[PDB]
């Protein structure tokens, strides 16, 4: 898995990240985004099931949405209304698990990318 799109962005703007997977088995995985902000433990961000259904983090205020394009082996994270506290390394992960509350847990996932840094600053 390879995440892309990180950079320096102004508060209030939006940013789209993507993650591309190798191989032929992309459609067989649910995909989840997590982040590691400086000085914090890993946080679940948002996930998408094999069928395309969104699973939101229990406290991230709806600002993070997700889509997948199976023909391109790619999943997308859209962050709206960026805040300084969104500064973090963002990771995407794959799991064979079906859509359920387990998609909000890191241990459910089998493969992880190397991450992409998002910095939000005025």
PDB file of C-alpha atoms in Angstrom:
ATOM      1  CA  UNK A   1       0.000   0.000   0.000  1.00  0.00           C
ATOM      2  CA  UNK A   2       1.301   3.472  -0.928  1.00  0.00           C
ATOM      3  CA  UNK A   3      -0.275   6.632   0.494  1.00  0.00           C
ATOM      4  CA  UNK A   4       0.122   9.930  -1.338  1.00  0.00           C
ATOM      5  CA  UNK A   5      -0.978  13.546  -1.128  1.00  0.00           C
ATOM      6  CA  UNK A   6       0.602  14.926   2.020  1.00  0.00           C
ATOM      7  CA  UNK A   7       1.872  18.469   2.204  1.00  0.00           C
ATOM      8  CA  UNK A   8       1.514  21.816   3.929  1.00  0.00           C
ATOM      9  CA  UNK A   9      -2.014  23.264   3.839  1.00  0.00           C
ATOM     10  CA  UNK A  10      -3.830  26.266   5.307  1.00  0.00           C
ATOM     11  CA  UNK A  11      -6.501  25.832   7.997  1.00  0.00           C
ATOM     12  CA  UNK A  12     -10.014  25.882   6.582  1.00  0.00           C
ATOM     13  CA  UNK A  13      -9.040  24.369   3.242  1.00  0.00           C
ATOM     14  CA  UNK A  14      -9.489  20.801   2.081  1.00  0.00           C
ATOM     15  CA  UNK A  15      -7.093  18.045   1.096  1.00  0.00           C
ATOM     16  CA  UNK A  16      -7.471  14.720  -0.661  1.00  0.00           C
ATOM     17  CA  UNK A  17      -5.107  11.850   0.047  1.00  0.00           C
ATOM     18  CA  UNK A  18      -5.000   8.609  -1.874  1.00  0.00           C
ATOM     19  CA  UNK A  19      -3.622   5.118  -1.364  1.00  0.00           C
ATOM     20  CA  UNK A  20      -2.846   2.681  -4.163  1.00  0.00           C
ATOM     21  CA  UNK A  21      -2.512  -1.070  -3.625  1.00  0.00           C
ATOM     22  CA  UNK A  22      -0.486  -3.480  -5.718  1.00  0.00           C
ATOM     23  CA  UNK A  23      -1.729  -6.709  -7.216  1.00  0.00           C
ATOM     24  CA  UNK A  24      -5.082  -8.080  -8.303  1.00  0.00           C
ATOM     25  CA  UNK A  25      -6.844  -8.553  -4.946  1.00  0.00           C
ATOM     26  CA  UNK A  26      -7.682  -4.918  -4.101  1.00  0.00           C
ATOM     27  CA  UNK A  27     -11.441  -5.458  -4.383  1.00  0.00           C
ATOM     28  CA  UNK A  28     -11.288  -8.196  -1.732  1.00  0.00           C
ATOM     29  CA  UNK A  29     -10.256  -5.745   1.024  1.00  0.00           C
ATOM     30  CA  UNK A  30     -11.959  -3.159   3.190  1.00  0.00           C
ATOM     31  CA  UNK A  31      -9.716  -0.108   3.581  1.00  0.00           C
ATOM     32  CA  UNK A  32      -9.179   2.078   6.642  1.00  0.00           C
ATOM     33  CA  UNK A  33      -7.355   5.330   7.289  1.00  0.00           C
ATOM     34  CA  UNK A  34      -5.585   6.054  10.573  1.00  0.00           C
ATOM     35  CA  UNK A  35      -3.302   8.880  11.669  1.00  0.00           C
ATOM     36  CA  UNK A  36      -0.422   9.492  14.078  1.00  0.00           C
ATOM     37  CA  UNK A  37      -0.347  13.093  15.261  1.00  0.00           C
ATOM     38  CA  UNK A  38       2.743  14.321  17.146  1.00  0.00           C
ATOM     39  CA  UNK A  39       2.479  13.480  20.838  1.00  0.00           C
ATOM     40  CA  UNK A  40      -0.634  11.299  20.478  1.00  0.00           C
ATOM     41  CA  UNK A  41      -1.488   7.631  20.101  1.00  0.00           C
ATOM     42  CA  UNK A  42      -2.711   6.346  16.744  1.00  0.00           C
ATOM     43  CA  UNK A  43      -6.248   7.469  15.875  1.00  0.00           C
ATOM     44  CA  UNK A  44      -8.733   5.757  13.595  1.00  0.00           C
ATOM     45  CA  UNK A  45      -9.995   8.186  10.944  1.00  0.00           C
ATOM     46  CA  UNK A  46     -12.468   6.472   8.602  1.00  0.00           C
ATOM     47  CA  UNK A  47     -12.968   3.179   6.756  1.00  0.00           C
ATOM     48  CA  UNK A  48     -14.761   1.803   3.702  1.00  0.00           C
ATOM     49  CA  UNK A  49     -16.075  -1.728   3.314  1.00  0.00           C
ATOM     50  CA  UNK A  50     -15.661  -3.890   0.214  1.00  0.00           C
ATOM     51  CA  UNK A  51     -19.153  -2.760  -0.801  1.00  0.00           C
ATOM     52  CA  UNK A  52     -18.338   0.924  -0.359  1.00  0.00           C
ATOM     53  CA  UNK A  53     -19.998   1.666   2.999  1.00  0.00           C
ATOM     54  CA  UNK A  54     -18.435   4.321   5.256  1.00  0.00           C
ATOM     55  CA  UNK A  55     -17.478   3.708   8.882  1.00  0.00           C
ATOM     56  CA  UNK A  56     -16.742   6.920  10.781  1.00  0.00           C
ATOM     57  CA  UNK A  57     -14.583   7.385  13.845  1.00  0.00           C
ATOM     58  CA  UNK A  58     -16.613   7.653  17.023  1.00  0.00           C
ATOM     59  CA  UNK A  59     -15.499  11.292  17.483  1.00  0.00           C
ATOM     60  CA  UNK A  60     -14.114  12.966  14.332  1.00  0.00           C
ATOM     61  CA  UNK A  61     -17.089  15.279  13.604  1.00  0.00           C
ATOM     62  CA  UNK A  62     -17.814  14.011  10.067  1.00  0.00           C
ATOM     63  CA  UNK A  63     -14.926  15.931   8.481  1.00  0.00           C
ATOM     64  CA  UNK A  64     -13.345  12.812   6.922  1.00  0.00           C
ATOM     65  CA  UNK A  65     -14.934  11.017   3.964  1.00  0.00           C
ATOM     66  CA  UNK A  66     -13.800   8.138   1.817  1.00  0.00           C
ATOM     67  CA  UNK A  67     -14.236   6.545  -1.590  1.00  0.00           C
ATOM     68  CA  UNK A  68     -12.679   3.755  -3.635  1.00  0.00           C
ATOM     69  CA  UNK A  69     -11.965   3.178  -7.330  1.00  0.00           C
ATOM     70  CA  UNK A  70     -11.328  -0.559  -7.714  1.00  0.00           C
ATOM     71  CA  UNK A  71     -10.301  -0.324 -11.369  1.00  0.00           C
ATOM     72  CA  UNK A  72      -7.477   1.981 -10.249  1.00  0.00           C
ATOM     73  CA  UNK A  73      -6.680  -0.054  -7.105  1.00  0.00           C
ATOM     74  CA  UNK A  74      -7.047   3.213  -5.187  1.00  0.00           C
ATOM     75  CA  UNK A  75      -8.846   4.508  -2.083  1.00  0.00           C
ATOM     76  CA  UNK A  76      -9.279   8.213  -1.302  1.00  0.00           C
ATOM     77  CA  UNK A  77      -9.486  10.173   1.957  1.00  0.00           C
ATOM     78  CA  UNK A  78     -11.083  13.618   1.765  1.00  0.00           C
ATOM     79  CA  UNK A  79     -10.362  15.956   4.694  1.00  0.00           C
ATOM     80  CA  UNK A  80     -12.576  19.024   4.787  1.00  0.00           C
ATOM     81  CA  UNK A  81     -12.195  22.163   6.886  1.00  0.00           C
ATOM     82  CA  UNK A  82      -8.617  21.370   7.868  1.00  0.00           C
ATOM     83  CA  UNK A  83      -7.566  22.258  11.401  1.00  0.00           C
ATOM     84  CA  UNK A  84      -4.075  22.569  12.933  1.00  0.00           C
ATOM     85  CA  UNK A  85      -4.863  19.443  14.985  1.00  0.00           C
ATOM     86  CA  UNK A  86      -5.119  17.469  11.715  1.00  0.00           C
ATOM     87  CA  UNK A  87      -1.324  17.679  11.444  1.00  0.00           C
ATOM     88  CA  UNK A  88      -0.283  14.037  11.463  1.00  0.00           C
ATOM     89  CA  UNK A  89       1.160  11.144   9.523  1.00  0.00           C
ATOM     90  CA  UNK A  90      -1.783   9.505   7.718  1.00  0.00           C
ATOM     91  CA  UNK A  91      -1.743   5.753   7.045  1.00  0.00           C
ATOM     92  CA  UNK A  92      -4.005   3.528   4.986  1.00  0.00           C
ATOM     93  CA  UNK A  93      -4.529  -0.174   5.811  1.00  0.00           C
ATOM     94  CA  UNK A  94      -6.310  -3.162   4.254  1.00  0.00           C
ATOM     95  CA  UNK A  95      -8.383  -5.933   5.840  1.00  0.00           C
ATOM     96  CA  UNK A  96     -10.459  -8.825   4.561  1.00  0.00           C
ATOM     97  CA  UNK A  97     -13.015  -8.055   7.279  1.00  0.00           C
ATOM     98  CA  UNK A  98     -16.517  -7.149   6.178  1.00  0.00           C
ATOM     99  CA  UNK A  99     -18.149  -3.891   7.175  1.00  0.00           C
ATOM    100  CA  UNK A 100     -18.629  -3.795  10.946  1.00  0.00           C
ATOM    101  CA  UNK A 101     -17.456  -1.996  14.072  1.00  0.00           C
ATOM    102  CA  UNK A 102     -14.244  -4.053  13.887  1.00  0.00           C
ATOM    103  CA  UNK A 103     -13.161  -1.808  10.988  1.00  0.00           C
ATOM    104  CA  UNK A 104     -12.511   0.948  13.556  1.00  0.00           C
ATOM    105  CA  UNK A 105      -9.679  -1.043  15.214  1.00  0.00           C
ATOM    106  CA  UNK A 106      -6.071  -1.176  14.002  1.00  0.00           C
ATOM    107  CA  UNK A 107      -5.754  -4.862  14.908  1.00  0.00           C
ATOM    108  CA  UNK A 108      -8.394  -5.747  12.285  1.00  0.00           C
ATOM    109  CA  UNK A 109      -6.022  -4.729   9.500  1.00  0.00           C
ATOM    110  CA  UNK A 110      -3.504  -6.932   7.721  1.00  0.00           C
ATOM    111  CA  UNK A 111      -1.396  -4.542   5.616  1.00  0.00           C
ATOM    112  CA  UNK A 112      -0.279  -0.936   6.142  1.00  0.00           C
ATOM    113  CA  UNK A 113       1.319   1.725   3.986  1.00  0.00           C
ATOM    114  CA  UNK A 114       4.351   3.840   4.799  1.00  0.00           C
ATOM    115  CA  UNK A 115       2.309   6.979   5.513  1.00  0.00           C
ATOM    116  CA  UNK A 116       2.097  10.546   4.244  1.00  0.00           C
ATOM    117  CA  UNK A 117       2.594  13.700   6.316  1.00  0.00           C
ATOM    118  CA  UNK A 118      -0.081  16.404   6.434  1.00  0.00           C
ATOM    119  CA  UNK A 119       0.866  19.699   8.083  1.00  0.00           C
ATOM    120  CA  UNK A 120      -1.869  22.282   8.693  1.00  0.00           C
ATOM    121  CA  UNK A 121      -0.570  25.731   9.616  1.00  0.00           C
ATOM    122  CA  UNK A 122      -1.484  29.380   9.141  1.00  0.00           C
TER     123      UNK A 122
END
